[PDB]
Design an enzyme around this catalytic site. Sequence first.
Site, PDB file in Angstrom:
ATOM      1  N   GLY A   1       0.533  -1.311   0.010  1.00 48.31           N
ATOM      2  CA  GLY A   1       0.092  -0.052  -0.457  1.00 48.31           C
ATOM      3  C   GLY A   1       0.487   0.930  -0.029  1.00 48.31           C
ATOM      4  N   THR A   2       0.159   2.229  -0.040  1.00 47.50           N
ATOM      5  CA  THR A   2       0.271   3.553  -0.846  1.00 47.50           C
ATOM      6  C   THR A   2       1.365   4.089   0.906  1.00 47.50           C
ATOM      7  OG1 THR A   2      -0.775   5.054  -1.789  1.00 47.50           O
ATOM      8  CG2 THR A   2      -0.214   6.163   0.291  1.00 47.50           C
ATOM      9  N   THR A   3       2.440   4.760   0.651  1.00 43.62           N
ATOM     10  CA  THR A   3       3.410   5.316   1.894  1.00 43.62           C
ATOM     11  C   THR A   3       2.623   6.053   2.607  1.00 43.62           C
ATOM     12  OG1 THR A   3       5.814   6.069   2.257  1.00 43.62           O
ATOM     13  CG2 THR A   3       5.020   5.943  -0.375  1.00 43.62           C
TER      14      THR A   3
END
Lengths: 241, 233, 205, 243, 250, 242, 244, 244
Positions: H30-32
């Site tokens: 997932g996105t940081t």
Amino acid sequence: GYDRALSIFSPDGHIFQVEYALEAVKRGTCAVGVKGKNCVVLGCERRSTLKLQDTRITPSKVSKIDSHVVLSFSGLNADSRILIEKARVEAQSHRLTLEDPVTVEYLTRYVAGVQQRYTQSGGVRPFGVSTLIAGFDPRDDEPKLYQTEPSGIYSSWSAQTIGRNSKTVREFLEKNYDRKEPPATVEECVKLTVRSLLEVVQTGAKNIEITVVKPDSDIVALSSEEINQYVTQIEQEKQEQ
Amino acid sequence: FRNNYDGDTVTFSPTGRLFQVEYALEAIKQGSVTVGLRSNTHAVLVALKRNADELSSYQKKIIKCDEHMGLSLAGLAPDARVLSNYLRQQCNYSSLVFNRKLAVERAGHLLCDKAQKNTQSYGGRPYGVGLLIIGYDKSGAHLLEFQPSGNVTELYGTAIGARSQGAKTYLERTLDTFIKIDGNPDELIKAGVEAISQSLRDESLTVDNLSIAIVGKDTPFTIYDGEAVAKYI
Amino acid sequence: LKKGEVSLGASIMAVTFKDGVILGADSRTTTGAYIANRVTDKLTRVHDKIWCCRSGSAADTQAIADIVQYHLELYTSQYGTPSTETAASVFKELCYENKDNLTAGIIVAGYDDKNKGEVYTIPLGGSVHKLPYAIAGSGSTFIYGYCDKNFRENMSKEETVDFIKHSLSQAIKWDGSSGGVIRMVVLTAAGVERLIFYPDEYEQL
Amino acid sequence: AGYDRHITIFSPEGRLYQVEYAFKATNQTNINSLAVRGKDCTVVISQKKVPDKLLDPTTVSYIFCISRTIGMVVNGPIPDARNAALRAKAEAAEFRYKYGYDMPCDVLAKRMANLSQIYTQRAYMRPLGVILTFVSVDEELGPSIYKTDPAGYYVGYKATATGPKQQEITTNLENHFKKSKIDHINEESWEKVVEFAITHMIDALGTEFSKNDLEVGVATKDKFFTLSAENIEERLVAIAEQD
Amino acid sequence: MTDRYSFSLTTFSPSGKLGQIDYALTAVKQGVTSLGIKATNGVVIATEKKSSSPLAMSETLSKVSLLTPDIGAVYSGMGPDYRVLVDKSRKVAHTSYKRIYGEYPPTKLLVSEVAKIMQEATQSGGVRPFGVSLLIAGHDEFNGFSLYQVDPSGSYFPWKATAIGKGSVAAKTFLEKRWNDELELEDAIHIALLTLKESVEGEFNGDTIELAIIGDENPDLLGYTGIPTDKGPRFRKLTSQEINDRLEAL
Amino acid sequence: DRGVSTFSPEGRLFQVEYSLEAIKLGSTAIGIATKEGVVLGVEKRATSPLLESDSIEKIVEIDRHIGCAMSGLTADARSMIEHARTAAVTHNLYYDEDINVESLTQSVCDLALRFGEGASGEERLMSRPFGVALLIAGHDADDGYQLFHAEPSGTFYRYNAKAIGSGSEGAQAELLNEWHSSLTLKEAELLVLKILKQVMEEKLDENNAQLSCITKQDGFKIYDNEKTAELIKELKEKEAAE
Amino acid sequence: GSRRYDSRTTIFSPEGRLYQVEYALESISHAGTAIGIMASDGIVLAAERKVTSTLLEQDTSTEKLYKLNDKIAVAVAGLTADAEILINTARIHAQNYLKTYNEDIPVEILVRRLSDIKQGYTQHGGLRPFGVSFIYAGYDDRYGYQLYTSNPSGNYTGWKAISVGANTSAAQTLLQMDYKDDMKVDDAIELALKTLSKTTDSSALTYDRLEFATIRKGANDGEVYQKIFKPQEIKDILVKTGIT
Amino acid sequence: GTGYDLSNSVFSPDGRNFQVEYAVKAVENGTTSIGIKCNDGVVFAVEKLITSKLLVPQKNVKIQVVDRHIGCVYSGLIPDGRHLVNRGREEAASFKKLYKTPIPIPAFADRLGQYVQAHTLYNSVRPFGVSTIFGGVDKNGAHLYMLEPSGSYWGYKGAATGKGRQSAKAELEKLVDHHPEGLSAREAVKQAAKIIYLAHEDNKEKDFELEISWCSLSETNGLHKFVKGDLLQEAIDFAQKEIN
Ligand SMILES: [Mg+2]
Ligand SMILES: [Mg+2]
Ligand SMILES: [Mg+2]
Ligand SMILES: [Mg+2]
């Protein structure tokens, strides 16, 4: 808390547990019921795997649900007892609320419903029992005979049998029972019934128990002797030829 | 491999995937197509209805949730009934208790949460239906896309169902255009119809096939079926 | 108040001052006109530096303080020392949520380093009121005038003990439901000091 | 039948594998701790290993203040340790409320052990992968150390050690006690006891420590407290004179 | 969440064996030996204090526990399971008996109660049997002295003398030879000490042995004087010193 | 094993799909909707000649204006019919009017997916889907004569004509060709009879097939054997022409 | 999930047999044999003890013969502990009936109730069955002396003479041979002991290996008397019959 | 044998809980998102992926507030994060209702930790598929925390999670080394926008949208506010500047 789905569909559309319940029925003693013009007779072969019993007490195979309706079965004895009690209670509850005893169809529909419920409720297995329910509707004289199976399916029969070798005796009935002259007498009805069980029980007097049900709460369980008199007269309409 | 990690939604695979949820996302991919697009004054839903035989009706895809909100479905219909019913209730609670119309953004948040609960507990099953929610609230027109994984996204336009990618590109191109069809309902609808007609293949959209819904400024969520969509083919 | 149960009657008060806050109380409990205990302690510790003055039902106030002491002990174990405002809220939650079955007039007083001394009075309905000082108990009616006229903010310890000593002796004088010795608990940065004053002293002031 | 290794049912040899594996988990953190009793104190030392530089050193602890009197050091993953900590804190408070006095270290130990036993017998609850060493200076018993494990076992100790190098520490401690003949460090100040503790952990692990490498907890009559980095250094600075 | 384990974890295998109970019996077999001997004027239960390290304080681990003032228990198997069984037994002695009849239960009934708890663990949903066998020794006005053994299945039986655990076979053998119905308590203690000596591996002394008797009433252990119907507890745990004094007359 | 509300890799609920297979082994049921009524016909299919055919209930009355035919595990339909009847009566009580056929059907289908083992969402106790499908036919003042096919999936479609049961693929095919927007009640009765005759294993007679219809004027009526036989006879003659 | 670990104790085999019931029956077939013989003037219950020793107290023991009423007693074959659970509920049902109707509970009524309980564990609940078979010996004013037997399936039946436990086939064959409808209690006792004597899996039948009980209506009284033989009484009756 | 990874609470032979570890994998996909603690506050920033141009810009807010002083951002299965925040909210409210003062950050952390850890105790629930970075301002300072699927959590100086976690943690270590004094919330806002931009390289195939929020005693009053307007663009620019 236990509610695992024990009765579930398999890839081909069969409910195994309900089908395996039919198998336990196939393994129980044979039961037959044929109806006359003014009676319904129920015959049952006696379990001969073990002998030295006390006939007086031992739970009979035909049971009175109310004074005018009886039920016989093939399957797990223990299971039959649960269906019999619920039917007896519903029979008294109906008298209490409707002010009239149950018709045979109603009683059948009730027992059948209980069996179906056990096919789609969690945590319980179906009843390994098929039943024959017969008697007469209040103030009516037309005999009734119904059959119920583990799936909960039910329907009425001029004559029908369940249990081991039922397939064989069903055949006998299929070509010895005519709806143009159904056993017009208690005597000839019992005869036909005995004839049918003889084709499977293998020469045994005490091996067969008959129960005759007439209109207005008249139900009588013929004695070992009264039946023996039938077996004899039957081996005559077989030996004279 | 699979039959080990795909029996319950409660099971994560070795790569961090939830297979039941992914299998749920698939039922959507076999459902008929529906489009959602909005300008700054109206939001429309266009959905291609699908039949079973040429002797049956075309299953409805649009459900009104309140006078200012509604959605189109794709996938397992019963599930859409379960979810749109929840939306109807939540919308109702806001009006009865606070005398406030439920915000689409809020509706989306609630749908996400309801779907999530069905993805973290054993015995259950994810919902197998996707929804496009359009509504007009205090902040204007809105279009939301709901997926059974629980991911809800607010968009300008979109589409779900088999061949959805077709209409999803027409809108992705037509954006600068439709986002400006303000004060003109029929145009927006037409834009939507044009969008939906880019995912067709089998037949052409007919009077028994099309389903459009529109909501906006002075337009309470209203559904146009059969007879009244003739002017858009 | 249930028929026949022990009543605290009382003359209790909590007064904040420069160094902190002081709690004071008489020591009489009664069942009708019988003094069931003439040397009770109405100053109850719910935390190291958070105490309360109890009045109303003896049973109820003890039950409540016992539960507060527990809530604050658990709070402490998890989040560190509780503020007097927190101790009051717990008392209030209990007094308010159970208003139909209790008779508890409680004054909560505590000392913190950031807030100095604080006083909260929780009257019969379970509402909470923060004040520079509070008086309660059946004897309190007789000193509303005296206290309002003589209280000054930022008094010294010596002055506050004197103010509380004079007020309560008056309260004890007029109220048959108050009497005994006057107990005080001084809550400051220095620690916790327990003071007790007998009849031969306070009576002739 | 073969799932007898996933839930707490007996294996054909009468073993509970899940409990055994819970024991391996207690070593996941690679931290060692020991506890010794003074004449009137109980000290627990635990190594502190802060890897990532992005962490706030002040929040990494495996020693918990259970009650005003009881301290507990946990060997095992932090989430399970904190689960145990919360429950022990709730139990000690409830006990005081219901019974009117502070729950003794050994009773808390027994209670926590009974809870572990339950996870050992009921299939739905998994065992917690931790070992709990409770220490205090009991009002009836004196300095006390009672340690519980995933099997639900607990017992009191003269001194104890826990962690990957448990055996070396234990042997070092056993040796000291066999040499001195008593069941406690004969020093009056908890400071020296703490010193003894650190010295022997150094001697046993064959490692030198700095202030940010240790964690210390002391229990004395009516209080249990953890030492600050600076107090630990005062201790280190003082040990660097016998050796 | 929730205990969805409402089904039995112990079931009958095709051979008619209840797997989990057999496995629990095996767990018991690896336990330290404990024995009990019934005399004419008392009963002795003994066990070895298998200290798992010398830093551990053996005294704080009572393997021999008083259930009622006239009943004691010892075991072989999983210690924690025993500890919880003792708690439950001490409690049921009050709830199903003292709070009803005003007197502690008779040995056989307390035993029957413990046995029932054990059976339920053999059939109730989501649990495994207890991995212990207990030797319960006690006395009561109408039955005198008794000694019972309770197994994981919940079956219990009375004994004149028996031993369970590791060296149970050899020990029961030593017991069969030495036992006779004319033994005074001291002689049973003596035989218990001998029997235990062969089961024990290393140091054998009062600090590595746990012995308790159920004998004459001990007024000095009542705590009060004045009521003459209750004369004291019959249960007494022998002290470290009491055991050594008897070890010297070996 | 594997759960009862599990999704397949294709996004279909296993139990529901397996349920539809059990339905393919049941007696055929045909309903045809016209502008003078809806006809429902069913194949009795007795397991032996000793069975009194009239005790075979596959066409049931839900209310005076709604009737229904079943196919599959007929016993499973008893609880469904019960709910259907209760829903229709309850609606009459609460609103002093007839329940709409669609509403009756939707209520019945709401039961469908209510199966599972603690399926997190609501309380659904039924260990498995229903193993029977229904043809619900009726009339209401807003949408006139309607026929609905209610499946265990919870979905239901309105049809102008529909066959369910073992001979449905074949029957449905004949229906597609024979149905038109101007059929008469008698024409419909005949077709049901004809198509039933085609797909049945046994020769269709008044004792092994059953007809019924629902009309605005007379409501739900199950045709008595005598009325049907005249219709069967009337058929043998119309087919024997060209 | 949890389904994984569920053995499914209440399912039918493809042949319509109840797995767990069949398996419990097998367990039972390894238990000491118990026999019940019904005479014209009484009933005998005899049982052979399993897992014994030189050190087992026999005086204060009962692991096979249990009193359910002053008029009904059972012989146990199977897991003693499972039996005790069922026995206690039967003892309660008995007293429940007495309180309600002020008459001792008919034997079959008590038997059917116990059987129904066993049947339950057979159709729902997901728990293992009780591994116990019972032989009930009892008397009532409607049928007099009765003997029943119940097994894990919950089915029960009535008998003139019966056995449960180990070597039933052998014992039943011997009973069917020497049993006569007009037997007197003194005769049944002998038969009971003889049968055990020949079916035992052990050396010789001794007193310390038996439990014996009779329910007679001593003509010099009225109330039926249940006698649970004490050790010395079993040694005695064993000599008279000739087993020594 | 095998299978130790099909059910949640099960310990593997090496003491690991495989289902929790697979949850972590969902987090790594997932996105940081990150968190930077400052001299008197905390800043949260997250990378929001632009799946297509149809996404209405700046509307799918991902950062969430708890009470009025806590910010929460997470990476992984977004819905699980929402679920976690819903509980945090109920937990924060409960605390305020009983104690009057808004929930301390360390106490809030543990509330979240205990709930997450609870989901690793049974096989009936799936662990959380998200790592949450959260914190805010309370009675005694600013606090930044990061919680993993195992329920593990600790306090941080800076924190990052998601695909670009390494670059982010890399840049974060730089900041903490260079500015030991603290970092003004202003600088942290800038630096956070930078770190996300740089971290965005670990997923350079899709265009993105920056989201920042902060809680500072001087700039927001100890309350959580999103970075909007002038302040945001300044941070966006400072980012696209220090990239090349
Ligand atoms: Mg006065
Ligand atoms: Mg467990
Ligand atoms: Mg589990
Ligand atoms: Mg990490």
